[PDB]
Amino acid sequence: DVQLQESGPGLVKPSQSLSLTCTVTGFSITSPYAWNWIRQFPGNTLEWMGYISYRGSTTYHPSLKSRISITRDTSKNQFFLQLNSVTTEDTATYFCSSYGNYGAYSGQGTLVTVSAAKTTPPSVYPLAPGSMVTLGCLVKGYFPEPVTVTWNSGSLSSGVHTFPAVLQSDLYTLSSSVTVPSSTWPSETVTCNVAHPASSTKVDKKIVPR
Amino acid sequence: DVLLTQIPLSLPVSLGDQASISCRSSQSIVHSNGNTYLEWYLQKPGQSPKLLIYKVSTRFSGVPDRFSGSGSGTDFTLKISRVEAEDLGVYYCFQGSHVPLTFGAGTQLELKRADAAPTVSIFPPSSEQLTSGGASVVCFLNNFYPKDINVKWKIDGSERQNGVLNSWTDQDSKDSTYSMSSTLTLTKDEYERHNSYTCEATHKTSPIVKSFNR
Numbered sequence A: 001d002v003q004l005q006e007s008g009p010g011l012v013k014p015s016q017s018l019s020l021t022c023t024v025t026g027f028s029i030t031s032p033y034a035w036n037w038i039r040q041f042p043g044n045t046l047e048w049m050g051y052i053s054y055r056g057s058t059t060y061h062p063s064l065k066s067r068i069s070i071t072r073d074t075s076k077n078q079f080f081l082q083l084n085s086v087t088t089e090d091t092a093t094y095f096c097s098s099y100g101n102y103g104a105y106s107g108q109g110t111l112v113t114v115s116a117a118k119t120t121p122p123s124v125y126p127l128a129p130g131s132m133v134t135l136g137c138l139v140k141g142y143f144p145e146p147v148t149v150t151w152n153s154g155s156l157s158s159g160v161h162t163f164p165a166v167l168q169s170d171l172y173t174l175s176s177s178v179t180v181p182s183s184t185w186p187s188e189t190v191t192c193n194v195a196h197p198a199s200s201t202k203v204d205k206k207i208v209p210r
Numbered sequence B: 001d002v003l004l005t006q007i008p009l010s011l012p013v014s015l016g017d018q019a020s021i022s023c024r025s026s027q028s029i030v031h032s033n034g035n036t037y038l039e040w041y042l043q044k045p046g047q048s049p050k051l052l053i054y055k056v057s058t059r060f061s062g063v064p065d066r067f068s069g070s071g072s073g074t075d076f077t078l079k080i081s082r083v084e085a086e087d088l089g090v091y092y093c094f095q096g097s098h099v100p101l102t103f104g105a106g107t108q109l110e111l112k113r114a115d116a117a118p119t120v121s122i123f124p125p126s127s128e129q130l131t132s133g134g135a136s137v138v139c140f141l142n143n144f145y146p147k148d149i150n151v152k153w154k155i156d157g158s159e160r161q162n163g164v165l166n167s168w169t170d171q172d173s174k175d176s177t178y179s180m181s182s183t184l185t186l187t188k189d190e191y192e193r194h195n196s197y198t199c200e201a202t203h204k205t206s207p208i209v210k211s212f213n214r
């Protein structure tokens, strides 16, 4: 019944400001006690940014107070986050949550990327070798995160490892491996399917020997 | 600021085990109304952190009885009387008694298993990438346990460190192993200066070596 839904832009340019909306359903933002904004940094630590109370008074993380503004729209049952002079260090998954005598409810969270980089599709390369056989796919120089990698539209998922993306210098790179029996390859087709929604790309790279 | 120290940061367990996580506060977390706003959260991968316990010992809605919280002053404890398959993930303690409201670093509740050596696979750069003037050499160190394995690149007898990009997967749900990818990023020209490319899985002798010649 209770739902907290984050919305807003996924990309923000450095020095510009990030604005997010929390749409609340199941109960009113007018119910005690606090309506929070939280962020989780890449593979990381959680930070409580601040809250707006059920009565509209704000409490901020002292370090963010000067850049941060939390507001609310009681009739729309929404509360808002504004973070001003943003740095690359503001790249995080942003969540909204609530606290009261019943405990706490949390939204799903959205990744907000702060970068000067422009949207770029990845270059997808097949990785064939020089009882079991490992093959791979190199997904290079895309922006922003994420990409999705599937092997033969999911039928090979069992022996698949999709590694987390690394940022260098302002672009992302990832690799994905698949291991199948020697009987299955090169005799049968092994294809790597890469999708980058942000740049509307869907590439299918087949693994060809020699 | 109130600093929250979680002990340990990594909790290896077997299913059915009793588990305990400690949360040590740098100062008292009793708010001016006499309440202690000490909370425990569980974050499963991809998901947002979900509340287990609030106000030290109150179980949130839908939280099983095997999860219990206790403590006072500066020492708080989360106990899991029986670890179930669904309880695996990262546990956080949080304090809401003093501003700024703060979290601990997180405790990874992970499955124990026997040691496993990685499977090493080395890949020369693709013809497609070479045509663009790029040459990435990729290596996989797959399905090992515990995290105690590293990569070492040797190019014609000399250790290579510059231009190496590494990434580690989370614990695999299939068999409780870890995997890592290592990419040596070169230009086509840089790649052409060398012959023998070696990728090794190392431990604190004995490395698992894979190599090719250009």
Ligand SMILES: CN(Cc1cnc2[nH+]c(N)nc(N)c2n1)c1ccc(C(=O)N[C@@H](CCC(=O)O)C(=O)O)cc1
Pocket: A032, A033, A034, A035, A036, A051, A098, A099, A101, A104, B031, B033, B037, B039, B095, B096, B097, B098, B101
């Ligand atoms: C000091 N805290 C702030 C506090 C505590 N834990 C948190 N935990 C989370 N997850 N988020 C936030 N924002 C929190 N904020 C705090 C203090 C007093 C009341 C309070 O007076 N609560 C009730 C009832 C008080 C009562 O028990 O009579 C009210 O309706 O005013 C709430 C929170």
